[PDB]
Amino acid sequence: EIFIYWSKSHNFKREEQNFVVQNEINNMSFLTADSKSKMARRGDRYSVQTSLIVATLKKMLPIGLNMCAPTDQDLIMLAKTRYALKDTDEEVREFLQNNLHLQGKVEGSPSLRWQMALYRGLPGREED
Amino acid sequence: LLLQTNLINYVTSIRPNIFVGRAEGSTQYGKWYFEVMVDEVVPFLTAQATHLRVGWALTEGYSPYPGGGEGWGGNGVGDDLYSYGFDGLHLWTGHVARPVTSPGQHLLAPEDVVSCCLDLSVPSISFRINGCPVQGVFEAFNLDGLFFPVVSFSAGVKVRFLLGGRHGEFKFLPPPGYAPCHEAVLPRERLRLEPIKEYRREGPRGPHLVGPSRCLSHTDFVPCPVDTVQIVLPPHLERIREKLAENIHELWALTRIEQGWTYGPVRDDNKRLHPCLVNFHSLPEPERNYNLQMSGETLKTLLALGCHVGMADEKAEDNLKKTKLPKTYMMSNGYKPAPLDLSHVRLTPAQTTLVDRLAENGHNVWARDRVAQGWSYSAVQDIPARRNPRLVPYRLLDEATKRSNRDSLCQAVRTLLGYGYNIEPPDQEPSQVENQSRWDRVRIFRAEKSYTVQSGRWYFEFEAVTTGEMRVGWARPELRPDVELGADELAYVFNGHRGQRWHLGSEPFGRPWQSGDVVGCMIDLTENTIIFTLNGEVLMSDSGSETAFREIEIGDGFLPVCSLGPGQVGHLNLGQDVSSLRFFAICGLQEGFEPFAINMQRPVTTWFSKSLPQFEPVPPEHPHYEVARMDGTVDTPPCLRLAHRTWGSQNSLVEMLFLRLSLPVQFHQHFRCTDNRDDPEIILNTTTYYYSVRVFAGQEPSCVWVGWVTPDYHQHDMNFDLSKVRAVTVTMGDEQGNVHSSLKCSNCYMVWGGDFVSPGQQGRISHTDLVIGCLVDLATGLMTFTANGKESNTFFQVEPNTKLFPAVFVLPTHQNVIQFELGKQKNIMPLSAAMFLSERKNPAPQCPPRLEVQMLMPVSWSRMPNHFLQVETRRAGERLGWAVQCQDPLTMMALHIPEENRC
Amino acid sequence: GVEIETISPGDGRTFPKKGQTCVVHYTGMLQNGKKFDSSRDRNKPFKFRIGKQEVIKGFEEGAAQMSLGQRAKLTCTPDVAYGATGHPGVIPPNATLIFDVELLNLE
């Protein structure tokens, strides 16, 4: 939700680098500090890739995608399409209720079958 | 003409790690004896007869790779000249079975005894069946390399190794002068039975790919120290010639005082009350000044190594004292420390390494001297037989004795350091023990071409059991087998021995692993990215980049590839079973990646770079070597000229090259009992065939070999000479001597071009081309050579049904090197009748397109079988020894190439 | 005519005489070392009536010398073999035949 606000508020983007340039934020120590502890120019001042919001997102993303079942990615890409049509959170929730039965099938693809095995085999996955 | 197919049983070989060999000043005794006990043998478990052979083999080329190969597969002992085998009826050598007379000859039946006698003082390998001698012995065989026991067996056998002493009792009396083979075990290792150099061993979770096994060498049993004679003794050393001797006159005596070995005035050293701590003046004078000049000898070793001394600080003589301890108190002329006492003094690692090699150079001089007095090695000590368990070079010695030697001289160098005199390390020179066989170091493992992927995101694991030079990554389908990964664009690999990434070079990336780590490689053909994950953690380059490689073209595709160095173990987990993956959920599962073999039934066909030389035709696009086919004119016969394209230029390729023709000549099935125009009545009946080679001007004949090779020649030596030619003579006779059948067999039939040149004062670059000719008589098996139209002294005789390939071994030293001439002479038939049946009565020589010149590629690709023979090996007990069992059958259908005689 | 070398001899007492069928489980090979026929591939013993000249002369005269359970290596010259006419499409003219015969049983 923080990244949603960042992605939508243009002034938040605009004064993000203003805070960066005024504080001389390197943005590399916040990611490579453990690399130095592990003994291991172009974007020297500011870049979108060095932002801490997405820097946190790339680490959170496997965790967030872990909860979602393998039958729901097909809903994710069509959700990307309807989100591209600028549908709010309430609207996309209603569209999910409009197409709940359009989710993936276990025998619909051999790629999904092993995904069910390695997803449902976790102790924390409850069938209810 | 047509390739033949047949069902062939899988054959594996099992050896004990008992290695023996001879060399100049060798520390290994050259006479040995062992036995093989046959428990159960199935005569026919499958359609092919059960294979079971016993004999010796050579450590530097006997590589019976499972699957197809020489002849009709199932290669074991005796199928090539790197091994000699006996199976109860034949003395197998050079893939030829020769019957031998025995007292009741038969195949290796259950409840049988096979005794092997090895002599290295003279070349001889004797055999005994059930104690009855075998009337046939190998002689005149190569000594280079090491000889070890080995049994080659198909499925359905139970054999036991009788090694005598503790691992058996030999059930018989070994011949005099022949020692039991169990005495040859090196002290650092324990006796065990392992197969020959392999590429796969089973593991708890899966097959472990195995990098080349490091092999011990005969040259590693000769102790070669640095000579300590031509050293003028320096003034600063004679100045300290005394204290460094006084401190080592009873240092070995200090430990045992005030114990059961406590000295007494009535006796002296070596009388179970040794110490005598008083002084060395009381001790005998010759060993006394001997100990002084042994301290000097250690200082001379320091000089020859590169150690020099310098005095800076306060003299230790002042601030040192002798401590009359309550321990080591004696009644004989007062009490004192047995060596000269010393206070707090330390030693840096340079001194540790230096004292290590100083003890090495002491041990190797002692061993050299003992050998010069005749002594040798035996794991059990025999003083009247003059054998010791410690007559091996220091590098092969045991850690107990290493520490015991190093302790005394560590005290000595410590006492030297106390006086402030510097121990100067010498210069560092990097050296490699083995350099020639650069190919028996990397064994590239990859998948079959049909598994090539050109899309999607893929994942696989590679558990690094060891932490050596092992590379894992992705490679293109046309990856060369004899080139290390990363040298070209055909590899995108991460070398994690020290944390480097390799693609058209090498640059640092990530961190090296440790034992047990799992390297999860990525590939993303959609995003054109390659990532390497170590223990579930994404590796980093020397920047903030998360991807090892980027902007990679799709190309022909990529394959999961890995390679292993010598003595390395790596488990490859391509992903056939998803549960077997360790870090897939941690990295790969949540980011759209999939296992490489996620939906497959059979295991992925994995191809390994087979490091055994084979003969293949020259590529037409070869930048260095080209072969030109010159048409036969009115006066010149057809020729195959070899010219070096890039000779005499920068970055050229200059190395020993082996050349051969693509077609053989087979000798007759039965040998016969007991102007300038060819006469038609006799040229149609002659059995003599002649070919010649033109050594061009500027090409030195000193590095030219000309002759014939049998199709089992796989000897790629860059420093090749006639000594390395494999050969063996098998002599057969009656029960009491009477050698009546002395058969000489060899794979390489070469002559030296340096013996065919007139030794003038100067002008070795002859303006006239050297035309060496070769004549072979198929009806008799006798073959000779002509220097310049005149016959030479050298000749060879071969057995019937033998195949010879026209070969020339040469080191290129000119723009034009050689030229294969398919000519003919007076009443001599050209090769067109000795290679083509349809051209048997065609006198005019021709060069048909099938005949073409071939190189000797060192490494060629091969396929690892989806199943391997299950061998049960264990120690049955003290009385029996080690038992080998194999019952599960495995059969392969092999396509056999007739002319090359290989399947 | 034929040269016999014993391989795994059995009893050496009872020989196949006239009147009873000879059941051999053999393995044939050409002199060059290329196998051309066997019976273990078919997994059925080769039963031939003795004395009726149904088998080649070399094989027929060889089979008498081995005993029950005796395996021997024969060597049949082309004269006692198919000879100049050979075996059409299988054995070339004037070839010497080596047979790894094993007289496993009689009847």
- DSSP state letter for B847: -
- Own/partner long-range contacts of B870-878 (Cβ < 8 Å, ≥24 apart): B871/B12, B871/B14, B871/B195, B873/B14, B873/B193, B875/B167, B876/B160, B878/B166
Alpha carbon distance B535, B166 (integer Å): 46
Q: What is the bridge-based pairing of β-strands B12-16 and C5-8?
A: unpaired
In terms of residues, how long is chain A? Answer: 128
Alpha carbon distance C32, A122 (integer Å): 64
Alpha carbon distance B259, B338 (integer Å): 14
CB contact under 8 A, B106 and C6: yes
Find which of B50, B89, B100, B668 to mutate to test the C interface (most C CBs within 10 Å of its CB): B89
In terms of residues, how long is chain C? Answer: 107
Active site residue C26: yes
Question: To the nearest whole angstrom, how far is the Cα of C61 from the nearest Cα of chain B?
Answer: 22
| Burial of B226 per CB tally in 10 Å (0-12, 13-18, 19+) | middle
CB contact under 8 A, B589 and A114: no
- DSSP state letter for B181: G
Cβ neighbours of residue B846 under 8 Å, at least 6 residues apart? Answer: B632, B638, B822, B832, B839
SS3 A98: helix
- B707: closest CA among B836, B630, B810? B810
Give the number of other Cβ atoms within 10 Å of residue B109's Cβ. 14
Are the CB atoms for C43 and C27 separated by under 8 Å? no
Question: To the nearest whole angstrom, how far is the Cα of C87 from the nearest Cα of chain B?
Answer: 18
- B170: closest CA among B134, B120, B118, B131? B131
Alpha carbon distance C54, C57 (integer Å): 9
Residues of A in contact with B591 (CB under 8 A): 61-62
Alpha carbon distance B54, B118 (integer Å): 13
Q: Does A26 touch chain B (CB under 8 A)?
A: no
CB contact under 8 A, C7 and B6: no
Find which of B46, B48, B667 to mutate to test the C interface (most C CBs within 10 Å of its CB): B48
- DSSP state letter for A66: H
Secondary structure in 3-state letters for B862-898: EECCCCCCCCEEEEEECCCEEEEEECCCCEEEEEEEC
Residues of B in contact with C34 (CB under 8 A): 4, 898
Token pair of C10 as six digits:
């059995």
- DSSP state letter for C8: E
| Burial of B196 per CB tally in 10 Å (0-12, 13-18, 19+) | buried
Alpha carbon distance C58, C76 (integer Å): 5
CB contact under 8 A, B590 and A111: no
Active site residue C56: yes
Token pair of B10 as six digits:
């899988």
User: What is the residue type of A33?
Assistant: A
Say how many CB pairs under 8 Å bridge B and C. Answer: 34
- B744: closest CA among B145, B79, B141, B91? B141
- Own/partner long-range contacts of B573-580 (Cβ < 8 Å, ≥24 apart): B573/B205, B573/B206, B573/B460, B573/B461, B573/B462, B573/B463, B574/B447, B574/B460, B574/B604, B575/B459, B575/B460, B575/B461, B576/B600, B576/B603, B576/B604, B578/A114, B578/A117, B578/A118, B579/A118, B580/B205, B580/B206
| Burial of B249 per CB tally in 10 Å (0-12, 13-18, 19+) | buried
Give the number of other Cβ atoms within 10 Å of residue B858's Cβ. 19
Alpha carbon distance B307, B611 (integer Å): 43
Alpha carbon distance B442, B565 (integer Å): 5
Find which of C5, C36, C40, C43 to mutate to test the B interface (most B CBs within 10 Å of its CB): C40
Q: Does A65 touch chain B (CB under 8 A)?
A: yes
Q: Which of C4, C37, C46, C48 is catalytic?
A: C37
Separation in Å, CA A32 to CA A23, A27, B51: 19, 9, 62
Q: Is A86 left (phi over 0), alpha (psi -120 to 50) or beta?
A: left
CA angle C44, C46, C47 (to 5 degrees): 120
Phi, psi of A115 (to 5 degrees): -65, -40
Active site residue C48: no
Q: What is the resolution of this structure in A?
A: 3.4
Q: Does B435 touch chain A (CB under 8 A)?
A: no
Q: Does A31 touch chain B (CB under 8 A)?
A: yes
Strand partners, B458: B523, B594
Token pair of B323 as six digits:
């401590």
Are the CB atoms for C104 and C64 separated by under 8 Å? no
Separation in Å, CA B643 to CA B707, B808, C8: 20, 14, 57
- B462: closest CA among B492, B439, B496? B496
Phi, psi of B290 (to 5 degrees): -60, -40
Separation in Å, CA A33 to CA A38, A40, B538, B544, C69: 9, 10, 14, 11, 81
Active site residue C41: no
Cβ neighbours of residue B217 under 8 Å, at least 6 residues apart? Answer: B59, B146, B434
Alpha carbon distance C46, C38 (integer Å): 10
Alpha carbon distance A90, A96 (integer Å): 10
Question: To the nearest whole angstrom, how far is the Cα of B902 from the nearest Cα of chain A?
Answer: 43
CA angle B229, B231, B237 (to 5 degrees): 120
- B154: closest CA among B44, B27, B31, B21? B44
Alpha carbon distance B55, B115 (integer Å): 9
Structural biology method used: cryo-EM
E strands within B405-527? 445-447, 457-464, 470-475, 491-495, 500-502, 506-508, 517-524
User: Can you state the percent helix, strand and coil of chain B, rounding each to 5?
Assistant: 10, 30, 55
SS3 B703: helix
Q: What is the bridge-based pairing of β-strands B853-857 and B739-746?
A: unpaired
**Angle formed by the axes of helices A73-84 and A89-98, nearest 10°:** 130
Return the residue of B nearest to A33 by Cα: B544
Token pair of C23 as six digits:
């059941």
Q: Which helix (H) or strand (E) holds B776?
A: strand B770-777
User: What is the residue type of C100?
Assistant: D
User: What is the residue type of B229?
Assistant: V
Q: Which helix (H) or strand (E) holds B861?
A: strand B860-863
Alpha carbon distance A25, A3 (integer Å): 20
Give the number of other Cβ atoms within 10 Å of residue B852's Cβ. 15
Give the number of other Cβ atoms within 10 Å of residue B257's Cβ. 22
Strand partners, B855: B616
CB contact under 8 A, B578 and A28: no
Alpha carbon distance A31, B544 (integer Å): 8
Alpha carbon distance B695, B817 (integer Å): 6
| Burial of B546 per CB tally in 10 Å (0-12, 13-18, 19+) | middle
Q: What is the bridge-based pairing of β-strands B853-857 and B657-661?
A: antiparallel
Residues of B in contact with A31 (CB under 8 A): 544
CB crowding B297-331: b at 16 or more within 10 Å, else e: bbbbbbbbbebebeeeeeebeeebeeeeeeebebe
Alpha carbon distance B407, B410 (integer Å): 5
SS3 C2: strand
Alpha carbon distance B23, B16 (integer Å): 22
Q: Which helix (H) or strand (E) holds B97?
A: none
User: What is the residue type of B34?
Assistant: F
CB contact under 8 A, B105 and C31: no
Token pair of C92 as six digits:
């070339």
Phi, psi of B359 (to 5 degrees): -70, -35
SS3 B201: strand
Active site residue C36: yes
User: What is the residue type of B123?
Assistant: P
The secondary structure of B37-79 as a DSSP string is EEEEE-S-SSSSPPPEEEEEEETTT----SSS-BTTS---TTS
Q: In chain B, positions 513-542, which contact chain A (CB-CB < 8 Å)?
A: 539-540
Alpha carbon distance B63, B77 (integer Å): 10
Token pair of B426 as six digits:
């010498």
* From C5, C38, C100, residue closest to B99, measured CB to CB: C5
Token pair of B685 as six digits:
């009946």
Q: Does B7 touch chain C (CB under 8 A)?
A: yes
Half-sphere exposure of B866 (CA within 13 A, CB side): 8
Alpha carbon distance B796, B751 (integer Å): 11
The secondary structure of B463-485 as a DSSP string is EESS-SSEEEEEE-TT--SSS-T
**Do C and A have ≥3 inter-chain CB pairs under 8 A?**
no
